[PDB]
Amino acid sequence: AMGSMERASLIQKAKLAEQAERYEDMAAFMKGAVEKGEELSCEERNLLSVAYKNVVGGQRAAWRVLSSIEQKSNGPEVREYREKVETELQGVCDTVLGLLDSHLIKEAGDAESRVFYLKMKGDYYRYLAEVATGDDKKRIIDSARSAYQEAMDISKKEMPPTNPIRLGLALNFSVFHYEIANSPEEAISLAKTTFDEAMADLHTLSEDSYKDSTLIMQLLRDNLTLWT
Amino acid sequence: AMGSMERASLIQKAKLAEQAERYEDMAAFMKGAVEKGEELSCEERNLLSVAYKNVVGGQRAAWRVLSSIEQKSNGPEVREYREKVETELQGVCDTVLGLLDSHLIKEAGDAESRVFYLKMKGDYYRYLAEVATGDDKKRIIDSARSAYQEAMDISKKEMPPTNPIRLGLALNFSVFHYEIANSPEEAISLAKTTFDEAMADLHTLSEDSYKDSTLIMQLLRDNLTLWT
Ligand SMILES: O=C(COc1ccccc1P(=O)(O)O)Nc1cccc(C(F)(F)F)c1
Ligand SMILES: O=C(COc1ccccc1P(=O)(O)O)Nc1cccc(C(F)(F)F)c1
Ligand SMILES: [Cl-]
Ligand SMILES: [Cl-]
Ligand SMILES: [Cl-]
Ligand SMILES: [Cl-]
Ligand SMILES: [Cl-]
Ligand SMILES: [Cl-]
Ligand SMILES: [Mg+2]
Ligand SMILES: [Mg+2]
Ligand SMILES: [Mg+2]
Ligand SMILES: [Mg+2]
Ligand SMILES: [Mg+2]
Ligand SMILES: [Mg+2]
């Protein structure tokens, strides 16, 4: 549906939708922009990520509310409506995964872009995993793992330990280990090593970069406090 | 689209959507329930009102953000996107007005139901008026006025001055006068007379009714403080 709108107008409208807190519109504008076929700049990758994280965040919050109610119940209505919200969530995740596979990741050659998109691939498979069950759950969990691991391998080779994308990737992979993979020790080890290596590299940063890095290190510390 | 779902299941799902903060779903479930053709109970009228007030509230907030940006700007993109949000808002208002006209108001014979639906008719014409301009704006403003006035005439004849529906109707009609009709003196007179007549009737109320009434009287007092 956004095929007739200029790329620059889609990006401008994504920014207006963010100001208006219209995240579904923001995601549709950014999907339109990706579908123009050109690579995304750093600012535009962040617009894509903010749009979809807010849309899926709403769906995840609702799914948790409904799943809770359903668990306590255990007519068909709660299960039906939880399944409706679940399907809509799966559709948003599949859309994002589709944009990454067609063709954002394959054209991303710089570390900052390739790590960003692989982290996104891990996060959306992780959201699919939260609602998955059984073996289905296993192949989805391994997809999330694989994407996070490739991103980590690149980030460790190509970025300093304070780089915010590297820090956020490590934060979310630690969450994957604690909440999805039933590996709390791996989660704690990852968050602690990430935190310690960033602290040792802070002396290299300007005031503004220091603020960016320490904000995410505080997220790692908040989890380590929750987990220990 | 809700034609195949039982009325009771639509109401149950509206309540689940409210818990999940899924207001668009809640509005669609309640639209489905109205379209079954049966009158709505007090609880169900309140579900209808909560659903649509939250959906239109989101649209109004976005419209104000975009209109502000547009005013400061004065390419086509801001105007285009403000118009998109405006059209979607107008559509929600027209949907609500349609449900009231087909056939909620005509079947509503009790004061509590008829005043509730006429107040709703005033509020949704008032939302249309907020985005209207010119003469178009005049006929919409008079529709809102007419609906509020019929509700007020019934409420004054049939309900005590502390009745929360009567109080909320007077609150919103005062807002209509201050914000839409450019009649701040009528707004202040209405809110003050409403407040004073309710205060004089509080002695008749139980503890729980007193809490319900005084909550809305505090809203009248908050406006009177903003307006004087
Ligand atoms: O509360 C959180 C914390 O999650 C994270 C913490 C650190 C890093 C990454 C995440 P996330 O990608 O799981 O959102 N996420 C979240 C995000 C959106 C919605 C809900 C809800 F509780 F409502 F389901 C939870
Ligand atoms: O802040 C308000 C206060 O409005 C009222 C006050 C008393 C009685 C009725 C109303 P309302 O029916 O105009 O919402 N309404 C409102 C409701 C939703 C959204 C926005 C936004 F500022 F974001 F556009 C404003
Ligand atoms: Cl459903
Ligand atoms: Cl289905
Ligand atoms: Cl490449
Ligand atoms: Cl638009
Ligand atoms: Cl158009
Ligand atoms: Cl009647
Ligand atoms: Mg072009
Ligand atoms: Mg399912
Ligand atoms: Mg490239
Ligand atoms: Mg039936
Ligand atoms: Mg228009
Ligand atoms: Mg009747």
Side-chain angles (χ1 to χ4, degrees):
Chain A
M2 303 293 179
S4 63
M5 203 186 303
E6 286 281 14
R7 192 180 186 285
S9 293
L10 289 165
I11 300 296
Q12 184 181 175
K13 288 181 192 181
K15 288 170 194 186
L16 291 169
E18 186 182 19
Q19 291 181 85
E21 294 175 67
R22 289 270 294 192
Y23 294 106
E24 294 179 31
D25 287 347
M26 190 187 179
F29 291 138
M30 290 310 300
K31 177 172 185 285
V34 170
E35 284 170 355
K36 303 299 181 182
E38 301 282 355
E39 293 185 26
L40 298 197
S41 68
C42 173
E43 183 173 7
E44 297 164 352
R45 294 188 303 266
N46 288 97
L47 290 170
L48 179 68
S49 178
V50 167
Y52 279 107
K53 165 196 207 297
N54 275 274
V55 169
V56 82
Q59 300 173 311
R60 289 165 72 205
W63 186 94
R64 295 182 185 181
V65 166
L66 298 170
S67 192
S68 182
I69 296 170
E70 186 186 10
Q71 282 167 317
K72 278 161 210 153
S73 279
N74 292 349
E77 288 85 356
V78 190
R79 172 188 53 74
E80 287 168 354
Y81 184 45
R82 186 268 303 156
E83 291 172 335
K84 178 175 132 159
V85 170
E86 184 171 302
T87 300
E88 291 184 9
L89 182 165
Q90 288 168 326
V92 170
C93 298
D94 286 346
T95 289
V96 170
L97 295 169
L99 295 174
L100 297 168
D101 199 51
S102 302
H103 297 276
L104 287 171
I105 290 168
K106 68 172 59 63
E107 301 282 6
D110 290 358
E112 319 280 297
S113 60
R114 189 167 188 88
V115 172
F116 187 94
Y117 291 135
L118 292 165
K119 179 187 168 289
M120 278 184 38
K121 179 175 185 171
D123 284 342
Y124 289 83
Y125 271 114
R126 168 157 68 81
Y127 306 150
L128 290 176
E130 287 179 334
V131 307
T133 61
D135 308 326
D136 169 49
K137 203 190 184 88
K138 300 188 175 156
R139 260 173 294 260
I140 293 166
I141 286 168
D142 201 67
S143 290
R145 184 199 58 72
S146 190
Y148 286 134
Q149 187 61 61
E150 183 181 343
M152 286 289 291
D153 297 338
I154 299 168
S155 75
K156 283 180 156 185
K157 293 185 159 211
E158 304 296 353
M159 296 164 160
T162 44
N163 180 103
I165 310 162
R166 182 173 163 179
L167 292 178
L169 163 61
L171 174 66
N172 289 203
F173 192 22
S174 69
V175 173
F176 164 81
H177 289 305
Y178 192 87
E179 294 189 355
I180 310 292
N182 190 27
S183 296
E185 290 171 336
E186 187 72 10
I188 287 158
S189 184
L190 178 61
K192 191 208 160 44
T193 293
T194 303
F195 182 98
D196 288 343
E197 298 168 17
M199 170 145 266
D201 183 56
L202 292 173
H203 68 92
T204 71
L205 303 183
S206 74
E207 165 68 285
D208 288 351
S209 291
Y210 186 90
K211 173 175 150 281
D212 293 329
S213 294
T214 55
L215 181 140
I216 304 164
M217 295 169 64
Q218 185 56 51
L219 300 176
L220 291 163
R221 210 183 223 152
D222 286 343
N223 285 339
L224 286 165
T225 299
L226 183 65
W227 299 337
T228 58
Chain B
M2 303 293 179
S4 63
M5 203 186 303
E6 286 281 14
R7 192 180 186 285
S9 293
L10 289 165
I11 300 296
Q12 184 181 175
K13 288 181 192 181
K15 288 170 194 186
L16 291 169
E18 186 182 19
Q19 291 181 85
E21 294 175 67
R22 289 270 294 192
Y23 294 106
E24 294 179 31
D25 287 347
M26 190 187 179
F29 291 138
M30 290 310 300
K31 177 172 185 285
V34 170
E35 284 170 355
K36 303 299 181 182
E38 301 282 355
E39 293 185 26
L40 298 197
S41 68
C42 173
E43 183 173 7
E44 297 164 352
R45 294 188 303 266
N46 288 97
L47 290 170
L48 179 68
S49 178
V50 167
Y52 279 107
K53 165 196 207 297
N54 275 274
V55 169
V56 82
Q59 300 173 311
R60 289 165 72 205
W63 186 94
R64 295 182 185 181
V65 166
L66 298 170
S67 192
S68 182
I69 296 170
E70 186 186 10
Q71 282 167 317
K72 278 161 210 153
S73 279
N74 292 349
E77 288 85 356
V78 190
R79 172 188 53 74
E80 287 168 354
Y81 184 45
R82 186 268 303 156
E83 291 172 335
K84 178 175 132 159
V85 170
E86 184 171 302
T87 300
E88 291 184 9
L89 182 165
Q90 288 168 326
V92 170
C93 298
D94 286 346
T95 289
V96 170
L97 295 169
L99 295 174
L100 297 168
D101 199 51
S102 302
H103 297 276
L104 287 171
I105 290 168
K106 68 172 59 63
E107 301 282 6
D110 290 358
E112 319 280 297
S113 60
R114 189 167 188 88
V115 172
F116 187 94
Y117 291 135
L118 292 165
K119 179 187 168 289
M120 278 184 38
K121 179 175 185 171
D123 284 342
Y124 289 83
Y125 271 114
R126 168 157 68 81
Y127 306 150
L128 290 176
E130 287 179 334
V131 307
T133 61
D135 308 326
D136 169 49
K137 203 190 184 88
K138 300 188 175 156
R139 260 173 294 260
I140 293 166
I141 286 168
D142 201 67
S143 290
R145 184 199 58 72
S146 190
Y148 286 134
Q149 187 61 61
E150 183 181 343
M152 286 289 291
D153 297 338
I154 299 168
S155 75
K156 283 180 156 185
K157 293 185 159 211
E158 304 296 353
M159 296 164 160
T162 44
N163 180 103
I165 310 162
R166 182 173 163 179
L167 292 178
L169 163 61
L171 174 66
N172 289 203
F173 192 22
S174 69
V175 173
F176 164 81
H177 289 305
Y178 192 87
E179 294 189 355
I180 310 292
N182 190 27
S183 296
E185 290 171 336
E186 187 72 10
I188 287 158
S189 184
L190 178 61
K192 191 208 160 44
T193 293
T194 303
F195 182 98
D196 288 343
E197 298 168 17
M199 170 145 266
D201 183 56
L202 292 173
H203 68 92
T204 71
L205 303 183
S206 74
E207 165 68 285
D208 288 351
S209 291
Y210 186 90
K211 173 175 150 281
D212 293 329
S213 294
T214 55
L215 181 140
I216 304 164
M217 295 169 64
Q218 185 56 51
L219 300 176
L220 291 163
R221 210 183 223 152
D222 286 343
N223 285 339
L224 286 165
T225 299
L226 183 65
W227 299 337
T228 58

